[PDB]
Symmetry: D2
Subunit: 363 residues, 4 copies
């Protein structure tokens, strides 16, 4: 069972811009029936009140439903739509479209890019940031691995998740139902949803043993983390959507993925290590990049390499916005291109203050 994955990084002019995707479909380069996932950077604030994420998904679902002659509801059941808000600094809004199809092809000369998709059930507000979310995410990650035809967790290089958050109305509704939520704070709820989801990845991949994970460890024990999880929260969904990206011997793709882990927000060495892991060994081979995907965050200590910063004290600009600008700038300075995927808030994703970074590259 050979599958071919193709990946298209498409600049966008606004959250609702489908024109670049339409161009690739109209020219025959993309059969829209073979799209399995779209990962976006959308130009809202990336925090609670970011409606560019939902706007982008609605616009893509409308377009694809009408191209395929099916309902928007069926498109959303069939295709993962993960919109990561926040395009701070020089970060360029874009979408990354994953196309997958069965092919009649012989055995790869090694392992090549593979992608799998799985969705969880919807969560009650009082399940976010708790073991209910951890365990359901872990189940879905294992399902997505099977979908990708990856049996060895060491061949998984990036697990991208969209997960829910709490709004004031959802917290108050939980209160009226007699239920207490993990945190009575809309912005901080994103951290708990991101972190519980990341711990689900680590559980599913065997990066952390189950006996170490409990409600009390979530967003507290930073010794527990996944080296490939990348999680992103939004008002526009009530479940978790999972994209597993790795390499498989059952892949006929002309692409590979590699990764490293940024030890902190300015770790350009880790960017170069991720490039090398994807087969890019010199600046001359940089044109083989399809995209770079990374997590960024403010370290809980309030410092980087012992130097204070204000990210956790700044009441005007939220810390995930600042972290995204910084890490996108670092990556852009290495690869010469700010149109790369950077997502903020890296709870249990790499060490405290760091985050996984993956590169999808042409062979």
């Amino acid at each position: 069972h050979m599958q071919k994955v193709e990946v298209f990084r498409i600049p966008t002019a606004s959250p609702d811009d489908i024109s670049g995707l339409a161009t690739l479909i109209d020219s025959g380069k993309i059969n829209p029936a073979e799209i399995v996932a779209i990962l976006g950077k959308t130009e809202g604030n990336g925090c609670v009140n970011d409606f560019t994420r939902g706007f982008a998904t609605q616009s893509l679902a409308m377009y694809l439903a009408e191209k395929l002659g099916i309902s928007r509801e069926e498109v959303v059941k069939k295709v993962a739509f993960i919109m990561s808000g926040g395009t701070e600094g020089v970060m360029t809004p874009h979408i990354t479209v994953f196309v997958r199809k069965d092919v009649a092809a012989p055995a790869a000369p090694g392992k090549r890019l593979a992608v799998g998709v799985a969705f969880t059930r919807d969560f009650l507000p009082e399940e976010l940031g708790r073991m209910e979310q951890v365990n359901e995410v872990a189940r879905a990650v294992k399902e997505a691995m099977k979908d990708a035809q990856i049996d060895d967790p060491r061949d998984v290089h990036f697990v991208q998740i969209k997960c829910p958050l709490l709004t004031a109305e959802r917290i108050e509704d939980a209160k009226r139902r007699g239920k207490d939520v993990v945190v009575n704070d809309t912005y901080k709820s994103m951290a708990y949803s991101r972190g519980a989801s990341a711990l689900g990845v680590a559980l599913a991949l065997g990066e952390i043993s189950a006996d170490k994970i409990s409600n009390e460890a979530i967003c507290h024990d930073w010794n527990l983390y996944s080296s490939v999880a990348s999680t992103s929260a939004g008002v526009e969904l009530l479940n978790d959507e999972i994209i597993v990206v790795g390499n498989s011997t059952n892949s006929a793709s002309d692409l590979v993925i590699g990764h490293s882990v940024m030890k902190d927000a300015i770790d350009a060495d880790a960017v170069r290590a991720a490039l090398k892991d994807a087969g890019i060994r010199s600046d001359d081979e940089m044109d083989r990049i399809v995209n770079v995907l990374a997590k960024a965050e403010a370290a809980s200590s309030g410092t980087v390499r012992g130097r204070r910063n204000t990210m956790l004290d700044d009441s005007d600009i939220n810390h995930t916005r600042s972290a995204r600008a910084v890490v996108n700038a670092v990556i852009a300075s290495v690869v010469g291109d700010p149109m790369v995927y950077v997502s903020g808030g890296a709870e249990h994703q790499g060490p405290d203050g760091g985050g996984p970074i993956a590169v999808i590259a042409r062979v």
Copy 2:
């Protein structure tokens, strides 16, 4: 001898503007040795990273030290400096200067304005938002009442407090010392400091019995509140400073204070009730206003009179900023003047979504 309190509401051009106070001192209207407290609205963001509060205090302490021929340290030991940041909407930056004269003259008939000042000990970071802060504030409020020569809590109409907050550096240092702080969030720490301080007022005044107050109730049980507490947090101090304002039979002041409680952020009726309680019975009598002092906040329900608002969901503008703009605008529309004191974050200060409102008026 006999206390006489005079109160001067002075517009400012910037946080460091001492010119209006200097004009009143140079004219002989204010003897600087008789200043006991200054309550400011300063034009920073009113949140964690607001340095206009400390800048204003430093500028006033420098100026008064040089006028009095004493050290800045002595001025700060002797005079309360309470700088409430955040001048959103049309709210006009200003300071309110409290002068206490000792006069060999009769008391005025009835009860007239009286002011008392007390400072607590410094608090360790791990004490903010907990019973150590509640109980020490209650002790100091009783001391300030004695300083004001008010022996009946019913004659206390406004208790204004400045209290500390947590920064990322202070939280990390607490962690290094093996201590758990009340909340691992700088902005939310302001709410816990404000709320514990307000409960200390309620305890001291007999508004709430001690047996109802515990660490678990702080910033949770909104049935517990003071009807006169007004608390404000800042990076620029490590203790609580307290100004008790009320009326005393042993006073020669030509001023009185009255108050009410806003039931919600748009309760103009409560503004008019506070004016009436201070002897202002018609629009023509509003020229007797010296200042209006009020607390404002976002209700935990995310609504006002059943109508949703975004204050608790908005990741760009923090909720205390929004609440200050709203309540200042409401008061300004009643009294015709936006140069009034409005402070945001009213945990245990009036009901959830409301806050105390006092008026100092000429007789």
Copy 3:
């Protein structure tokens, strides 16, 4: 006979159509008779506010599918004016205008009437200039006819959506060798709003044409309309006009009245607008359908002699602050923060003030 019905509907998010769908499914609203929807959407109300477009897309998709027509036809048939920015306590909502033909006598006197017109698309270099003024003026007169209002004194509110400049549009104009009115995205909203407002004043006879030139736009604050309400967005390239007034040829059980806020804290003008709409005492406040107002920071940096930081605050843009203030003032008078307040009142009321209208049940 014309009969206008108006529904103020709370929304849970920019894309929330549930309240409108409830009214349609119950038979209160025939979707074919909707002529305009005026929204407050919870984005920042400035340049990078996509809640306006998200709301319009969601409503157009819902109505297109209910009516069995294309979204393109819906947007030609219905004015969608989405005013972003729900600061302070201001409650997100939509106001739906329904116009029916009824076989009943016109009501005594004058009753609510509405008209809609659209302009052509504008080139970036036309925004904030006489091209926009004159084309809006033509559309306003067209919308007056649509409303069957002959006397401009019977127009009480003219709501407009107009375009703005983004960095990409400015750069494209540069590449084409064309200078724009201002090389500033946020300020371009002011020029678009102001030129559109002067178009209203021109069409209504509030200001004679000889007084208006490119040089006076966003400069001569003596020139203003007392009924114009303009709002800018990235989501359109033309101007959309809703004229609201009263006509003798109307059978609506609603009326509209208005006043002008002299400044951002002018509660007296709120009460005057209520009275102009027939609400003369507090106990009649439940006859409000909605209140619609413009708010702005005064160029002097003061209100009633008192400084504020609106024009100096680099964190929060001045139209956000003005909306929070004026919504709070109105809410404190009427007891309800779910009213329409739009910021940036260039040539709309005096400098620092803005028109305020009340649609009320008779």
Copy 4:
């Protein structure tokens, strides 16, 4: 013979003088030899940033008390340039310049030299206009003399603090019958920065006087200085100038070099500036005293053909975003986010770029 010593000191808050006090109390700094302090302070770096003034007041009060002189005399003697905005990972700090007269001989080649000069106060209506250009140019020449630098090729960084407009100052100008360069407080910072930078270019011969006019300021991006670094603030009414370069008549154990970032992600220019200061490999990075750079949003709204939102974002002003980006780029090259990055680079390097200098131990 002049010897310049430079101390980069982390700060805990805008008013933190403890690190400087420690260097004085240990005998490493004689406070009477301080000639300039260049700070990064943690306010927003825009109009309503009072951390800059708070930092200057705190340092002037500390130094006045240590020296037994008045604060007023300290401010007449020492340049205090506080650049607000510490976005991203940028670490608040101050850089203290100490100049000693020493009997030592002629150190081989050229070594670090510093000079200081102040302009007169400007009226608000003078900001962004030729009067500011010309007065700054005269002060830059005076500062070069103070530094004992006669050749403009030996000037590597000219750091300036300059004024801005607030609403109150604009109203003052209007009351006096004057118009200001722009009726926009945030944009006024760009005009003050840009006019000041053109004054540097004029003084250094980087542009000819006949090419500079009021109309060119903040419009002709072909006119720029490759060493000017300008920063605006509410806390002063004049321009303060620090010229940093190398002189044959210097005994400093430090040198300065520079390059120009072509855009906000130009790490090659960071490396070039390091190499120009004698740092030839990653293992010599420990010789850095500080890195000083200008950052800005390009007028095109793009970096290397890729769109960004810096000029469209109504929540976060573009100089805040540019500072975060360029500090992150420099930090990733040198391994330390405690470097000086200032935003808004009008006529400082190309459009979208800015000068970058390195002070390094020999």
